[PDB]
Antibody, heavy 227, light 214 residues
Framework: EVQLVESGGGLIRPGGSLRLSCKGS????????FGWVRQGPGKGLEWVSG????????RYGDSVKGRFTISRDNSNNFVYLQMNSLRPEDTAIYYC??????????????????????????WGRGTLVTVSSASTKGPSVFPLAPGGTAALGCLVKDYFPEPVTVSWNSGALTSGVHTFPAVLQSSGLYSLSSVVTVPSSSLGTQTYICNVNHKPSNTKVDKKVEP | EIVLTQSPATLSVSPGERATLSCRAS???????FAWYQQKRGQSPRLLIH???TRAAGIADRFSGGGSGMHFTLTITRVEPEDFAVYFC?????????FGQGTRVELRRTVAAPSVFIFPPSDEQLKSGTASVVCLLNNFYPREAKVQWKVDNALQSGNSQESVTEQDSKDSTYSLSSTLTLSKADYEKHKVYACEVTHQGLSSPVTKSFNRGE
């Protein structure tokens, strides 16, 4: 029953803005503090912003201070995060997270029902925020032509944005397939490759096709990988 | 700002064994102001311990937390198969609140040498000004592995990119790719293209190579 649904991700231009939203339900929203935690490319967690039950106390992270604003609407169970002057380094998965339902003051007195943003017991599925200045580009699909077995694959090079999906033989081939995580290149474009190991004797008979699809650029490629 | 450094970066453990994670703080942190999280692949973080030693909701009693000052720990008494994930420490004794870099608890299997393959650039790609050579390291353990490119014996640097799969769910192995990207003109001026792999399961560095054109 207890849910936190984010909304408001996507592609942002350097210098642009974005407002995140989080709808809480299944609990007394009024009693809890809230926060946002981001997760960068191949990285860990970074505490971004947090506000307490009545939105009166609100702190931010060093790298985001002065650019971001957090706020809430208890009568409608929403918590927002305004993001101004975004930079490429801000590219991360943003999680809406529920803080405590209590707090302690400087005197060591614990206040029940007045939550804050120390730690987070409930986390949303998170939303991806991509901050790049790149135009949409379709990838170039290249063949990776072939102990006791043989390896072949496809090179999916220079595309934007994420993601692409790769399959072998329209989905008929799964065993041995390793589709690698994309790597961001110095140009801001992504590249990846998908490989599969097969019996070295089947090369002359069985045909192998890789199915590459990149929706944002309207690009589908079916490449037949041969010796 | 308070910096949190976790160690080790990777704890390779077998099921049923004891696991003790460590977090080090740049400054003194109050013992009752610390938290730990678990992070499975593709999932959101989940609170394990809060306020230093208190287990969160629905957390198995095999998890425990302790520490003070600049040294905090998380202990799994006996790791179950559903305990393999990344773990984050987090301080909130001082603002701005900070996390650790994370510690991946991996399934420790037996050592397995990688299968190694090398792929020359397609002619199709060469007909477009660039040349990419790919070295494939299939199914190996542990994941620590050195890949070195060489072009006419001269070993390369600053022009390659590695990518590694998540640990396999069926045989607990890793696969790695390395991509050497050259300009066509550079690719034309050399014959020998080699990928030298160093790994623990190899008594000596394995080399797969090819002569351009042949």
């Amino acid at each position: 029953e207890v849910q936190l649904v984010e909304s408001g991700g996507g592609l942002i231009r350097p210098g642009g803005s974005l407002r995140l939203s989080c709808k809480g339900s299944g609990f007394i929203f009024e009693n809890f503090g809230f926060g946002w935690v981001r997760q960068g490319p191949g990285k860990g967690l970074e505490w971004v912003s947090g506000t307490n039950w009545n939105g009166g106390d609100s702190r931010y992270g060093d790298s985001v201070k002065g650019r971001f604003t957090i706020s809430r609407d208890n009568s409608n169970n929403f918590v927002y995060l305004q993001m101004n002057s975004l930079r490429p380094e801000d590219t991360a998965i943003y999680y809406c997270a529920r803080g405590t339902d209590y707090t302690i003051d400087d005197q060591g007195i614990r206040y029940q029902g007045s939550g804050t943003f120390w730690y987070f017991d409930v986390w949303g599925r998170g939303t991806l925020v991509t901050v790049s200045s790149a135009s949409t580009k379709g990838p170039s699909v290249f063949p990776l032509a072939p102990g006791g077995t043989a390896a072949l694959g496809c090179l999916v090079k220079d595309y934007f944005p994420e993601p692409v999906t790769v399959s072998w033989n329209s989905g008929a081939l799964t065993s041995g397939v390793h589709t690698f995580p994309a790597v961001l290149q110095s140009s801001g474009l992504y590249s990846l490759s998908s490989v599969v190991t097969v019996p070295s004797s089947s090369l002359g008979t069985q045909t192998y096709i890789c199915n590459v699809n990149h929706k944002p650029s309207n690009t589908k490629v079916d490449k037949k990988v041969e010796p | 700002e308070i910096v949190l450094t976790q160690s080790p970066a990777t704890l390779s453990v077998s099921p049923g064994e004891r696991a003790t994670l460590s977090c080090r703080a740049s400054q003194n942190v109050h013992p009752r102001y610390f938290a730990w999280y678990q992070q499975k692949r593709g999932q959101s973080p989940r609170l394990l311990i809060h306020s230093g030693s208190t287990r969160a909701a629905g957390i198995a009693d095999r998890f425990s937390g302790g520490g003070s000052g600049m040294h905090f720990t998380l202990t799994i008494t006996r790791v179950e198969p559903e305990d393999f994930a990344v773990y984050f420490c987090q301080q909130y004794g001082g603002s701005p609140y900070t996390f650790g870099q994370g510690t991946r608890v991996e399934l420790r299997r037996t050592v397995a040498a990688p299968s190694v393959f090398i792929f020359p650039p397609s002619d199709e790609q060469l007909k477009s000004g660039t040349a990419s050579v790919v070295c494939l390291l299939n199914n190996f353990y542990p994941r620590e592995a050195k890949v070195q490119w060489k072009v006419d014996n001269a070993l390369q640097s600053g022009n390659s990119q590695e990518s590694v799969t998540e640990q396999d769910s069926k045989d607990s192995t890793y696969s790695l790719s390395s991509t050497l990207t050259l300009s066509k003109a550079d690719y034309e001026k050399h014959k020998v293209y080699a990928c030298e792999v160093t790994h623990q399961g190899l008594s000596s560095p394995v080399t797969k190579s090819f002569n351009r054109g042949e």
